[PDB]
Design an enzyme around this catalytic site. Structure first.
Site, PDB file in Angstrom:
ATOM      1  N   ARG A 258      -7.392  -3.273  10.014  1.00  0.00           N
ATOM      2  CA  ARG A 258      -6.419  -4.181  10.338  1.00  0.00           C
ATOM      3  C   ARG A 258      -6.880  -4.686  11.965  1.00  0.00           C
ATOM      4  NH1 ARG A 258      -2.300  -4.125   7.501  1.00  0.00           N
ATOM      5  NH2 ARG A 258      -1.620  -2.150   6.487  1.00  0.00           N
TER       6      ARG A 258
ATOM      7  N   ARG B  37       3.041   5.998  -3.126  1.00  0.00           N
ATOM      8  CA  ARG B  37       4.425   6.925  -3.854  1.00  0.00           C
ATOM      9  C   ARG B  37       4.582   6.571  -5.119  1.00  0.00           C
ATOM     10  NH1 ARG B  37       4.422   5.755   1.676  1.00  0.00           N
ATOM     11  NH2 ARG B  37       6.179   6.759   3.000  1.00  0.00           N
TER      12      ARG B  37
ATOM     13  N   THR C 228      -2.266   7.998   4.362  1.00  0.00           N
ATOM     14  CA  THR C 228      -1.099   8.323   3.460  1.00  0.00           C
ATOM     15  C   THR C 228      -1.525   9.403   2.312  1.00  0.00           C
ATOM     16  OG1 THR C 228      -0.720   5.888   4.228  1.00  0.00           O
ATOM     17  CG2 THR C 228       0.805   6.966   2.451  1.00  0.00           C
TER      18      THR C 228
ATOM     19  N   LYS D  36       0.749  -1.086  -0.032  1.00  0.00           N
ATOM     20  CA  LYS D  36      -0.112  -0.025   0.004  1.00  0.00           C
ATOM     21  C   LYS D  36       0.916   1.114  -0.090  1.00  0.00           C
ATOM     22  CE  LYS D  36      -2.651   0.531   3.533  1.00  0.00           C
ATOM     23  NZ  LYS D  36      -2.219   1.955   4.431  1.00  0.00           N
TER      24      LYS D  36
ATOM     25  N   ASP E 168       2.109  -0.833  12.292  1.00  0.00           N
ATOM     26  CA  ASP E 168       0.938  -1.359  11.557  1.00  0.00           C
ATOM     27  C   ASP E 168       0.656  -2.755  11.947  1.00  0.00           C
ATOM     28  OD1 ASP E 168       0.026   1.012  10.383  1.00  0.00           O
ATOM     29  OD2 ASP E 168       1.366   0.745   8.641  1.00  0.00           O
TER      30      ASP E 168
ATOM     31  N   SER F   3       7.400   9.564  12.036  1.00  0.00           N
ATOM     32  CA  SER F   3       6.276   9.520  11.214  1.00  0.00           C
ATOM     33  C   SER F   3       6.921   9.467   9.805  1.00  0.00           C
ATOM     34  CB  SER F   3       5.375  10.582  11.322  1.00  0.00           C
ATOM     35  OG  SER F   3       4.572  10.721  10.114  1.00  0.00           O
TER      36      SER F   3
ATOM     37  N   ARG G  70      -7.951  12.354  12.133  1.00  0.00           N
ATOM     38  CA  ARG G  70      -6.905  11.863  12.191  1.00  0.00           C
ATOM     39  C   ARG G  70      -5.845  13.360  12.163  1.00  0.00           C
ATOM     40  NH1 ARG G  70      -5.595   6.788   8.722  1.00  0.00           N
ATOM     41  NH2 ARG G  70      -3.482   7.167   9.692  1.00  0.00           N
TER      42      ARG G  70
HETATM   43  O1  LIG Z   1       4.114   6.409   5.043  1.00  0.00           O
HETATM   44  C1  LIG Z   1       3.480   5.406   5.200  1.00  0.00           C
HETATM   45  O2  LIG Z   1       3.182   4.671   4.053  1.00  0.00           O
HETATM   46  C2  LIG Z   1       2.869   4.841   6.251  1.00  0.00           C
HETATM   47  C3  LIG Z   1       3.538   4.991   7.553  1.00  0.00           C
HETATM   48  C4  LIG Z   1       2.941   5.053   8.992  1.00  0.00           C
HETATM   49  O3  LIG Z   1       2.166   6.310   9.265  1.00  0.00           O
HETATM   50  P1  LIG Z   1       2.813   7.398  10.299  1.00  0.00           P
HETATM   51  O4  LIG Z   1       3.546   8.550   9.438  1.00  0.00           O
HETATM   52  O5  LIG Z   1       1.713   8.289  11.235  1.00  0.00           O
HETATM   53  O6  LIG Z   1       3.806   6.729  11.444  1.00  0.00           O
HETATM   54  C5  LIG Z   1       1.906   3.895   8.819  1.00  0.00           C
HETATM   55  O7  LIG Z   1       1.203   3.661  10.221  1.00  0.00           O
HETATM   56  C6  LIG Z   1       0.835   3.998   7.630  1.00  0.00           C
HETATM   57  O8  LIG Z   1      -0.161   3.134   7.667  1.00  0.00           O
HETATM   58  C7  LIG Z   1       1.572   4.228   6.338  1.00  0.00           C
HETATM   59  K   LIG Z   2      -6.584   3.832   5.927  1.00  0.00           K
END
Ligand SMILES: O=C(O)C1=C[C@@H](OP(=O)(O)O)[C@@H](O)[C@H](O)C1
Ligand SMILES: [K+]
Length: 436
Positions: free
Chosen positions: A388, A27, A97, A22, A316, A168, A124
């Site tokens: 999840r 990206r 994301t 995902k 996750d 993050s 969020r």
């Molecule tokens: O950059 C990403 O693709 C992700 C990073 C994490 O988030 P955070 O940046 O809040 O840690 C993760 O929990 C999210 O499901 C996907």
């Molecule tokens: K989601």
């Protein structure tokens, strides 16, 4: 409304390919959209989240062809400046994301954008991006530092040097995206490594980048070059089966072609501490991204103090990992994991509730959880609309003493559209039934 309903498993069996990653998918299409030339994307994850990203890019005049049944996009790049002003707000559905990365993309555009999503998305936290973007020269309005976001694009951002205050990748990613549009150097310092998919795709698209110490920098105004991408399986998706086979007696399974980025390897490192039987073999490297085959055999587990450097690398997987904790011998404690509270749902509250509902003594802490290893009973748990949590309790149903009813599973398709089909294929028992 649809629910999952399980009955116990007599052992998982077989060899499956989980679908695409995902995080890398988001990206890959974002970068391809503004690249120059034609990018072919294999292994693209065809779920509601990644598709919502595809839609949003198309609202702004990306040229993307979607071949759903092969997991292929064909992207005809529009260059850095080829995007057009969308007429309506960009609906990011359930995808954190997408909103956080789009915000970085959109901050340096010579136009304006509204970004929003579903109920869960609208709770969020966004301060973590609004603040550092604003230090680069962005204007972004919001009530209460949550979506919707209204972005007054500024095609004259200046790069910053910035330290992440939580670990993050979204924040890091958001800022690098903006960085490609800003005048001068943008440098992110990260005290604890987070997933580095963005970094890898930049190198892949031949935008130069530089590691320094903990820091990573780009300079604004470079050009992204089209280059075919092949996306490995989401190890987050593989994590459900990795656990399921670990805790179900008589299980033995091979998982083909899963991504094994060490910044994503949390759940394997931790299950190994717990005594699990997990073999990683056949290492490749297609497009910068480590890929391997994972063999899992049933093993008995022991509770652990989850070391806190693994928290970012497992963020996750804590929902399903905690199912493992519930059926280990002894006590498990999770600390420095407050980030779990600000996800699709509050994942600590969701997991404490359903585990108690299934006979497990599980106790909440502000940054984690205390689990006393025990015996899963059948009963009924709520998913809280979180993919999840739904999938973790479907895994729990494999060992549970009787059936497990998991309410409201429609958001499973945000990250794992063929979950039921693959679960049944390897010997879990999961069925879609009408909800309320
Ligand atoms: O950059 C990403 O693709 C992700 C990073 C994490 O988030 P955070 O940046 O809040 O840690 C993760 O929990 C999210 O499901 C996907
Ligand atoms: K989601």
């Amino acid at each position: 409304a649809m629910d999952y309903q399980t009955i116990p498993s007599q052992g998982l069996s077989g060899e499956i390919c989980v679908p695409g990653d995902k995080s890398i998918s988001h990206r890959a299409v974002l970068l391809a959209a503004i690249a120059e030339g034609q990018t072919q994307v294999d292994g693209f994850l065809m779920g509601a989240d990644n598709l919502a990203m595809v839609s949003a890019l198309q609202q702004m005049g990306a040229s993307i062809q979607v071949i759903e049944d092969e997991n292929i996009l064909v992207v005809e790049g529009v260059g850095m400046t080829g995007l057009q002003a969308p007429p309506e707000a960009l609906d990011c559905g359930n995808s954190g994301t997408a909103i956080r990365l789009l915000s970085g993309l959109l901050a340096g555009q010579p136009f304006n954008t509204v970004l929003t999503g579903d109920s869960s998305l609208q709770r969020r936290p966004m301060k973590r991006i609004i603040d550092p973007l604003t230090l680069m020269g962005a204007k972004i309005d919001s009530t209460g530092n949550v979506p919707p976001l209204k972005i007054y694009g500024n095609p004259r951002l200046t790069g910053i040097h910035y330290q992440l205050p939580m670990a993050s990748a979204q924040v890091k990613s958001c800022l690098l995206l903006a960085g490609l549009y800003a005048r001068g150097k943008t440098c992110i310092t990260e005290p604890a490594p987070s997933r580095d998919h963005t970094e890898r795709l930049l190198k892949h698209f031949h935008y130069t980048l530089q590691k320094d110490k903990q820091s990573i920098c780009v300079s604004g105004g470079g050009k992204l070059k089209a280059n075919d991408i092949s996306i490995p399986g989401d190890i987050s998706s593989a994590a459900f089966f990795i656990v399921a086979a670990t805790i179900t007696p008589g299980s033995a399974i091979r998982l083909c072609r899963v991504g094994v980025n060490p910044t994503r390897l949390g759940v394997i490192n931790l299950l190994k501490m717990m005594g699990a039987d997990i073999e990683v073999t056949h290492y490749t490297e297609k497009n910068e991204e480590p890929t391997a085959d994972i063999t899992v055999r049933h093993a008995r587990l022991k509770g652990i103090d989850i070391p806190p450097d693994q928290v970012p690398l497992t963020i996750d997987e804590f929902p399903v990992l905690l199912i493992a904790a519930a059926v280990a011998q002894g006590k498990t404690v999770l600390r420095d994991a407050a980030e779990l509270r600000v996800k699709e749902t509050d994942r600590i509250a969701a997991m404490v509730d359903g585990l108690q509902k299934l006979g497990i003594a599980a106790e909440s802490l502000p940054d984690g959880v205390i689990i006393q290893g025990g015996t899963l009973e059948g009963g009924e748990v709520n998913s809280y609309d979180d993919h999840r949590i739904a999938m973790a309790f479907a895994v729990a149903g494999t060992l549970a003493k009787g059936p497990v009813r998991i309410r409201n599973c429609d958001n499973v398709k945000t990250s794992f559209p063929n979950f039921v089909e693959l679960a049944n294929e390897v010997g879990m028992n999961v069925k879609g039934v009408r909800g309320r």
